[PDB]
Amino acid sequence: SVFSERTEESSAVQYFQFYGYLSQQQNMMQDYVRTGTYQRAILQNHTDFKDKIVLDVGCGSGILSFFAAQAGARKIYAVEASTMAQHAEVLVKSNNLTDRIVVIPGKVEEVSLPEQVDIIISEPMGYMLFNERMLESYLHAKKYLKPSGNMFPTIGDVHLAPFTDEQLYMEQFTKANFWYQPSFHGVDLSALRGAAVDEYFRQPVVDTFDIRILMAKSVKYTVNFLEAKEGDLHRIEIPFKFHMLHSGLVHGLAFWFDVAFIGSIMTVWLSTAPTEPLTHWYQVRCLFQSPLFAKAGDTLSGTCLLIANKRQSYDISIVAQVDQTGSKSSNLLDLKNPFFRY
Amino acid sequence: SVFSERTEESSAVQYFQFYGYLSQQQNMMQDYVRTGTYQRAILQNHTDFKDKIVLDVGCGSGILSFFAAQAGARKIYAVEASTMAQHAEVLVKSNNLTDRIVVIPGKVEEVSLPEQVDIIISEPMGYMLFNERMLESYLHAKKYLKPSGNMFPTIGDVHLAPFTDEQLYMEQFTKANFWYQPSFHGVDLSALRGAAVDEYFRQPVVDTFDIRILMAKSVKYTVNFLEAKEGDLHRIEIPFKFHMLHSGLVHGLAFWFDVAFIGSIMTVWLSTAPTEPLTHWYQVRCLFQSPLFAKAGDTLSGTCLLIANKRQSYDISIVAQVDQTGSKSSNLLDLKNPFFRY
Ligand SMILES: NCCCN(CCCNc1ncccn1)C[C@H]1O[C@@H](n2cnc3c(N)ncnc32)[C@H](O)[C@@H]1O
Numbered sequence: 177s178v179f180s181e182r183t184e185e186s187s188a189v190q191y192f193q194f195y196g197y198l199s200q201q202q203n204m205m206q207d208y209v210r211t212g213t214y215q216r217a218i219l220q221n222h223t224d225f226k227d228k229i230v231l232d233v234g235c236g237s238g239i240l241s242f243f244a245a246q247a248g249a250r251k252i253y254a255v256e257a258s259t260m261a262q263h264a265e266v267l268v269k270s271n272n273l274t275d276r277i278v279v280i281p282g283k284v285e286e287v288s289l290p291e292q293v294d295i296i297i298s299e300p301m302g303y304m305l306f307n308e309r310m311l312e313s314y315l316h317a318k319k320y321l322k323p324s325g326n327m328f329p330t331i332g333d334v335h336l337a338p339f340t341d342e343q344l345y346m347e348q349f350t351k352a353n354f355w356y357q358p359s360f361h362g363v364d365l366s367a368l369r370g371a372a373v374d375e376y377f378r379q380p381v382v383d384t385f386d387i388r389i390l391m392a393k394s395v396k397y398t399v400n401f402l403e404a405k406e407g408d409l410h411r412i413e414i415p416f417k418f419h420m421l422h423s424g425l426v427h428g429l430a431f432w433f434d435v436a437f438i439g440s441i442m443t444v445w446l447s448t449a450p451t452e453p454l455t456h457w458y459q460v461r462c463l464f465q466s467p468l469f470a471k472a473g474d475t476l477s478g479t480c481l482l483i484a485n486k487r488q489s490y491d492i493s494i495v496a497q498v499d500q501t502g503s504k505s506s507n508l509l510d511l512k513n514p515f516f517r518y
Numbered sequence: 519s520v521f522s523e524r525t526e527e528s529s530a531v532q533y534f535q536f537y538g539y540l541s542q543q544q545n546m547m548q549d550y551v552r553t554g555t556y557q558r559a560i561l562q563n564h565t566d567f568k569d570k571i572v573l574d575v576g577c578g579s580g581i582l583s584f585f586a587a588q589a590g591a592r593k594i595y596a597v598e599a600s601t602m603a604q605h606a607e608v609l610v611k612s613n614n615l616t617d618r619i620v621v622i623p624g625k626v627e628e629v630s631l632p633e634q635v636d637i638i639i640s641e642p643m644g645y646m647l648f649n650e651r652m653l654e655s656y657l658h659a660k661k662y663l664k665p666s667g668n669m670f671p672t673i674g675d676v677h678l679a680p681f682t683d684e685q686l687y688m689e690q691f692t693k694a695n696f697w698y699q700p701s702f703h704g705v706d707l708s709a710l711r712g713a714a715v716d717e718y719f720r721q722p723v724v725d726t727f728d729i730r731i732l733m734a735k736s737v738k739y740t741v742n743f744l745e746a747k748e749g750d751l752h753r754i755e756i757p758f759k760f761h762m763l764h765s766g767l768v769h770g771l772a773f774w775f776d777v778a779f780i781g782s783i784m785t786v787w788l789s790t791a792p793t794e795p796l797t798h799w800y801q802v803r804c805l806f807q808s809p810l811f812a813k814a815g816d817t818l819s820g821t822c823l824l825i826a827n828k829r830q831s832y833d834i835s836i837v838a839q840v841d842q843t844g845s846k847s848s849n850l851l852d853l854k855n856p857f858f859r860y
């Protein structure tokens with residue numbers, strides 16, 4: 177299928193084993209911003225669900241399907257590929273909703289639905305929005321969407337902004353300099369120092385931060401889920417031209433994201449911005465191995481290219497330059513292996 | 519090969535990817551008790567290495583191979599299956615030891631060695647000794663061992679003892695009881711409570727503790743690496759009969775291990791006991807889902823059975839009973855996915 181074609185088997189095995197744990201579902205359920213905002217978006221747009229047909233893509237515990245049932249849905253197909261499906265089925269029986277929620281085990285790229293749906297709901301966002309490549313499954317699910325059907329969430333915005341954080345930058349060399357020792361128990365390790373540095377800088381940094389580190393207004397890249405095709409996410413090119421609001425050393429780019437549920441009654445936003453309450457997505461920072469000096473009023477221009485790989489993630493390429501000086505920095509990160517710094 | 523036949527491919531992929539990171543090698547090398555004790559064992563038994571042939575099983579960075587070279591070895595074959603092999607070769611060239619240390623990339627079950635060896639050295643101990651199933655690779659390497667050849671380490675002792683720790687039990691139980699909620703955002707989760715508790719209680723707890731929690735003298739199970747066959751580790755049965763020294767609630771069993779390097783000059787011990795300075799193995803505790811009340815002078819009898827699985831780990835069954843009352847507890851733990859509590 178489409179999923180098997182884009183995913184190495186080892187990665188899929190690990191991924192669905194991970195999501196088969198109740199502790200992981202629980203971790204996501206306990207994110208109050210996430211769960212509360214989803215419930216609110218669904219219940220306050222009750223006309224988009226009352227007596228409607230719903231598809232829940234990757235239902236996990238089934239929480240969103242139960243929210244759709246609370247809003248009056250007639251029939252909800254809840255698709256889930258990990259062993260969590262079995263758990264979801266138990267919940268459906270214990271909440272007396274067997275006539276309204278049908279759990280379907282398997283991948284949404286491989287299962288069958290008995291009918292087309294009025295609305296698709298899902299929680300397909302990973303770190304930096306795109307991690308885990310679940311958005312593609314979400315977009316794939318539009319083969320089951322009736323003409324003029326809706327999607328919750330409806331659109332996604334990724335934000336990027338340059339930051340300064342001298343201590344974060346320094347920590348990488350401090351860790352790597354373990355190898356810059358000529359007699360570790362009699363062994364000269366120094367020839368690996370460079371490799372160590374490289375390894376640490378290929379990891380995106382997952383945590384939160386004070387907004388005062390941001391040096392320019394963010395640039396936005398938008399995916400409209402009603403319109404986008406799976407193939408649009410294999411190569412994501414984000415050009416940027418920042419007008420520097422503060423002078424300093426740019427140590428890298430920070431990323432966050434919002435999604436919007438565009439309903440008939442109201443639009444509801446779920447934001448992971450550093451100006452908003454913390455979520456379990458935090459924010460993501462990609463460091464430059466060579467920082468760039470910038471003056472307030474200078475322009476920092478370049479490109480962030482995200483190239484989808486078969487490990488359900490992206491290879492990140494960031495090229496940036498300060499236009500007033502021509503000083504450049506290029507960087508390659510592996511989004512599959514972030515550094516959880518919180 | 520033997521390795522591929524006993525190992526799922528997804529697990530092997532993840533395992534060797536994990537050991538390909540310099541940060542992980544660094545973490546293990548920085549355990550000074552481990553590294554220092556290995557160097558001491560090898561250097562103080564220099565006659566076991568001087569002008570000898572050595573096989574280093576899973577050399578990683580190559581540190582033990584460098585130790586063997588310091589002790590005067592003539593030739594060291596250092597076998598490594600992750601990409602760390604490449605890094606090891608770098609070090610071998612930068613320490614001017616190309617004439618003595620030969621890095622051989624691949625699994626020790628699959629490579630070819632040009633000659634038989636006088637001594638096999640390795641660091642094959644995981645959490646609770648047996649995790650990672652690396653001991654079997656170590657034992658497999660005995661196909662290259664000359665008659666009357668030695669192994670470093672030479673023997674392993676696993677220790678088990680009953681413990682009381684109300685706070686640990688309560689912390690796990692509280693995490694599980696999220697799934698006892700009858701109205702999580704209006705949804706009844708309580709039918710999964712039993713599942714939740716099972717999941718949480720099958721993760722062994724990796725951390726250290728004060729020895730005052732131990733309620734009886736430890737029982738010892740010994741594996742002699744000079745004598746054991748690979749097959750002996752597929753099913754490890756450890757019967758136990760504890761004489762309770764203190765009254766209270768037995769919340770589970772604590773595990774640690776020692777290894778001995780039995781050399782021609784002296785025997786050197788590396789201990790992970792809670793009475794000894796801390797190592798990065800810590801100690802491991804398997805909790806009982808239902809604790810057992812015991813009085814001082816009672817006998818707590820049963821069996822710990824470890825069944826090797828294809829995920830490079832073991833399914834652990836612990837059955838224990840207080841003989842004086844017939845109170846029993848049965849437990850299944852998944853050693854592959856511990857809870858790292860430190
Ligand atoms: N709301 C219900 C839980 C939604 N889960 C959200 C994960 C993203 N969350 C997150 N949070 C913090 C940091 C990073 N990421 C994802 C769930 O979708 C399931 N699945 C993923 N692909 C699937 C596929 N192609 N076919 C069927 N099922 C699929 C998956 O097995 C998981 O159970």
Ligand SMILES: NCCCN(CCCNc1ncccn1)C[C@H]1O[C@@H](n2cnc3c(N)ncnc32)[C@H](O)[C@@H]1O
Nearest residue numbers: 537576577578598599600625626641643644645655798
């Ligand atoms: N000191 C030297 C580094 C030794 N590494 C020690 C592991 C210690 N485990 C542990 N666990 C918890 C806490 C602390 N330590 C293990 C290394 O052996 C490598 N490997 C594993 N199987 C192999 C195979 N069948 N054939 C070839 N290579 C093999 C592995 O790739 C790793 O690099």
